[PDB]
Amino acid sequence: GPVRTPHACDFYADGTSEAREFATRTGPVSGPVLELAAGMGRLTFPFLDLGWEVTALELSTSVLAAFRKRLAEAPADVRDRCTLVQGDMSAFALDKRFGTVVISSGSINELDEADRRGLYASVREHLEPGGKFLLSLAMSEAAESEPLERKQELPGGRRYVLHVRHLPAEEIQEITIHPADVCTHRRRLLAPDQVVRELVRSGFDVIAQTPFASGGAGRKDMVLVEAVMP
Amino acid sequence: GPVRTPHADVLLASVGERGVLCDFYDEGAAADGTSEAREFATRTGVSGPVLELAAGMGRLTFPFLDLGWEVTALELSTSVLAAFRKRLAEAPADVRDRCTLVQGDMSAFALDKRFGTVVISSGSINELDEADRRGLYASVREHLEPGGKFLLSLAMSEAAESEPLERKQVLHVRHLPAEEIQEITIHPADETTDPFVVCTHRRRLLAPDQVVRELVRSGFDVIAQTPFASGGAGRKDMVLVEAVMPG
Ligand SMILES: Nc1ncnc2c1ncn2[C@@H]1O[C@H](C[C@@H](N)CC[C@H](N)C(=O)O)[C@@H](O)[C@H]1O
Ligand SMILES: Nc1ncnc2c1ncn2[C@@H]1O[C@H](C[C@@H](N)CC[C@H](N)C(=O)O)[C@@H](O)[C@H]1O
Numbered sequence: 309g310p311v312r313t314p315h316a317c318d319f320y321a322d323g324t325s326e327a328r329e330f331a332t333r334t335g336p337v338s339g340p341v342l343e344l345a346a347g348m349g350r351l352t353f354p355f356l357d358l359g360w361e362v363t364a365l366e367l368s369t370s371v372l373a374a375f376r377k378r379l380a381e382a383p384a385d386v387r388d389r390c391t392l393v394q395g396d397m398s399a400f401a402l403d404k405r406f407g408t409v410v411i412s413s414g415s416i417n418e419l420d421e422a423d424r425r426g427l428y429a430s431v432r433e434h435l436e437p438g439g440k441f442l443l444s445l446a447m448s449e450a451a452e453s454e455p456l457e458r459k460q461e462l463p464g465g466r467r468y469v470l471h472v473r474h475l476p477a478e479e480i481q482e483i484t485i486h487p488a489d490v491c492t493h494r495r496r497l498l499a500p501d502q503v504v505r506e507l508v509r510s511g512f513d514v515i516a517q518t519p520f521a522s523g524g525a526g527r528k529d530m531v532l533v534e535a536v537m538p
Numbered sequence: 539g540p541v542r543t544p545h546a547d548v549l550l551a552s553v554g555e556r557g558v559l560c561d562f563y564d565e566g567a568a569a570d571g572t573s574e575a576r577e578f579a580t581r582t583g584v585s586g587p588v589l590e591l592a593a594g595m596g597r598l599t600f601p602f603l604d605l606g607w608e609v610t611a612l613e614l615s616t617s618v619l620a621a622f623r624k625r626l627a628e629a630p631a632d633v634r635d636r637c638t639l640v641q642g643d644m645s646a647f648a649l650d651k652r653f654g655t656v657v658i659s660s661g662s663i664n665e666l667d668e669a670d671r672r673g674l675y676a677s678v679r680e681h682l683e684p685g686g687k688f689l690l691s692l693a694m695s696e697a698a699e700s701e702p703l704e705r706k707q708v709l710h711v712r713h714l715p716a717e718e719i720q721e722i723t724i725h726p727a728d729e730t731t732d733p734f735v736v737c738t739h740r741r742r743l744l745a746p747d748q749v750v751r752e753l754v755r756s757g758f759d760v761i762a763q764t765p766f767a768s769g770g771a772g773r774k775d776m777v778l779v780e781a782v783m784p785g
Contacts, residue, residue, distance in 0.1 A: 315710055421668050448713050450697065455721075457545070467727035468568065471545050474695045474743060475719040486708035497713065 311492045313484050319493035323412075325524030327354030330410055330442055333518065333532050339407040342434060344397040344427070345415035348374040349390075355410075356386045363391045365400060398426035405436040413446040413530060416503065417496045424503075428510035432537060441512065441535040443503065447519065447528070451476045451499040477502045500531040507535050540564075541738040543723045549736055556732045562724060562739040573770040574659065575601035577778050578689055581764070582655050589653040589681060591644040591674075592662035595622045602657075603633045610638045612647060645673035652683045660693040660776065663749065664742045671749075675756035679783060688758065688781040692746040694765065694774070695720070715745040746777040759784045 310318040330351075334341075337360060346352045346364035348371055355362050366372050372394060379387045393402065397411065398419055409431050419427055431441050455473040462468045476499035485491030504514050512535040519528035540561040550557045562568070575598045582588075584607055593599045593611035595618055602609050613619050619641055626634055640649065644658070645666055656678050666674060678688050695718055702712040720743040725736045750760050758781040765774035 313710075449703075450713060450715075456696065461727060468724055469727050471543075471723040473543075473721045474697060475721055475740075477719050477742075478716040480714040480716050480748075482702075482712040482714055484710035486710060488708050494714075496716075 311482075311494050313482060313492055315484050317490050317492055319483055319485055319491045321350065322523075323351040324354050325520075326412065326444055326522055326530070327351050327358065328524075329444065329518075329520045329530075329532050330355070331358050333442060333516065333534050334408055334440055337408055340391075341408040341410055342402075342406040344409065344411040344431075345418065346375065347371060347414075349378055351410075351412055352390065353378070353382070353386075356382075356389050359389075361389050363393060363402070363404075363406070365393045365395045365397060365402075367394065367396050369394070398423040398430070400430050400434075402434060405434055405439070407436055407439050409435055409439065409441045411443050413444045416443060416445065417498055420496075421506075424506060425510060428507065428512070432511055435537055437537070439537065441507075441537075443533040443535070444520075444522075445500040445503055445531045445533060446497060446522075447500050447531050448476070448479055448481075448497055450479060451501065452519075475499075475501065500533065504533060507533070511537060513538050541721070541740050543721060543738050545723045546736050546738050549723075549725060549734075553729065553734050556730070556734040558733050558735050560735055560737050562722060562737040565735075566737075567735075568724060568737060569595075569597045571597045571659075571768075572601045574598060574691055574768060574776070575605075577691065577764075577766050577776075578602070578657055579605055581689060581762070581778055581780055582687065585654045587651070587653050587655075589649075589651075589656040591647075591656065591658040591678075592665060593622065593639075594618060594661075596625060598657070598659060599637065600625070600629075600633075603629075603636055606636075608636045608638075610640060610649070610651065610653070612640045612642045612644060612649075614641070614643055616641065645670040645677070647677050647681075649681060652681055652686070654683050654686045655689065656681060656686070657689045659691045663690060663692065664744055667742075671752060672756065675753060675758065679757065682783060684785060685782070688753075690749065690779040690781070692749055692777045692779060693720075693743060693768075694746050694777050695743055698745040698747065699765075699774075714747065716748045717745065718743045746779065750779060753779070753781050757784075758782065 340361040342363045344365050346366045352364045458472045460470045479497040481495045481497045483493040507514050514535050516534040518532045520530050521528050522530045540559050587608045590609055590611045593613045599609055599611045697715045702714050705711050719740050721740050723738050753760050760781050762780040764778040766776050767774050768776045
């Protein structure tokens with residue numbers, strides 16, 4: 309069913325800039341790239357334009373058909389560089405390994421906690437040694453802000469100072485679309501720091517976290533996370 | 539080892555050698571909830587047996603027992619149950635006999651008994667990840683009698699207390715708090731002391747409204763949510779949630 313918000317029928321771009329941010333933090337890419345939950349190629353087409361060879365993994369049959377149709381419209385050199393694969397980013401086996409594994413924010417926020425461990429484990433099995441796992445992650449106002457530290461003085465007779473902070477971990481992005489004269493959606497919104505803690509917990513060293521602007525200009529509303537297997 | 543907080547980092551540099559970094563839940567030279575217990579009592583008003591989940595060493599249980607309540611207290615840790623059993627042995631035989639102690643996992647438990655009231659505290663539900671909480675909710679449903687209540691206390695952070703900020707554009711967007719990490723750093727008000735022990739800890743801190751969404755999704759009707767102060771006065775730092783099975 310639909311979500312009845314406080315101000316309420318449910319609600320259900322260009323990846324050139326986001327794609328380039330990925331290309332900056334990989335450097336030179338010897339070998340094919342695995343993109344997880346590729347959708348209809350919002351990022352995959354920009355990746356192919358960088359000359360990459362991409363294996364694009366997507367769960368939906370319907371979304372795959374849209375992707376395949378788009379590929380048929382592309383020049384032969386583009387299409388020839390894209391291998392489409394039906395699969396589940398939280399649990400896949402292609403038997404092959406890759407120098408680079410890529411996932412966008414819209415995709416990782418699709419997975420709950422247990423499914424994310426599925427994802428992390430699967431990526432470990434598909435990275436060649438010295439391989440790079442790259443993630444973009446949306447960063448909310450709360451996730452970017454320094455947490456407000458609270459102080460309290462407390463006795464017993466021995467006096468103590470208690471400091472408390474609250475670190476962002478997960479929010480819900482709630483939407484209400486409106487004819488200005490009733491559409492609705494709640495989605496998960498992980499703090500990049502949360503995903504990074506999860507990455508470390510699951511085996512990775514996180515070597516860089518670079519904020520960037522998704523649309524290539526203005527406020528930096530995303531983070532590129534580079535993770536590697538030690 | 540322990541969580542090395544930003545404030546801990548700078549203290550330990552500034553203290554040189556007197557300084558030791560510890561987690562709050564270990565070597566601890568550093569419990570009363572008669573007021574939280576009263577919030578529960580105030581929102582029950584009782585027919586029969588009460589199930590208390592993750593009862594710990596009875597910080598709420600003993601207060602409940604003092605009200606005439608028959609309490610089943612469920613706890614996972616055997617050492618904690620041992621310490622509960624000791625306290626319960628030093629208690630008047632009227633208190634001692636209205637208390638049943640059971641070892642169990644509040645995420646997947648099963649008793650040969652149903653209850654008019656089931657209670658859990660914030661400290662406790664935040665013990666559980668998302669999957670385990672679903673296990674909790676399902677298990678609780680199975681232990682409620684017709685018309686029985688599930689009562690939860692939930693700590694409420696500043697971000698959880700605020701009305702989420704909107705950005706009108708018409709497009710209404712809100713970011714609702716779901717889960718935070720509560721991070722503490724505790725040290726003596728002095729600086730000498732010796733040893734200078736800095737105590738840190740990180741725990742899960744769910745938004746009361748997130749738990750409410752989760753309860754509703756699990757098949758409960760949430761029929762009230764009441765903010766209250768855990769120290770009977772000051773900022774209301776806690777919410778009392780009441781849930782029932784729709785009949
Ligand atoms: N478990 C899963 N495995 C693989 N793909 C998934 C899974 N769950 C959801 N998806 C897909 O993840 C995608 C998420 C979308 N936001 C599209 C992302 C796409 N990279 C884009 O930029 O538009 C959808 O295309 C879903 O069909
Ligand atoms: N899965 C579980 N089932 C039952 N008890 C648990 C579980 N996980 C943790 N605990 C206990 O939950 C308690 C949490 C504590 N904050 C104590 C709660 C107690 N009501 C008090 O106010 O002191 C500890 O006693 C843990 O041993």
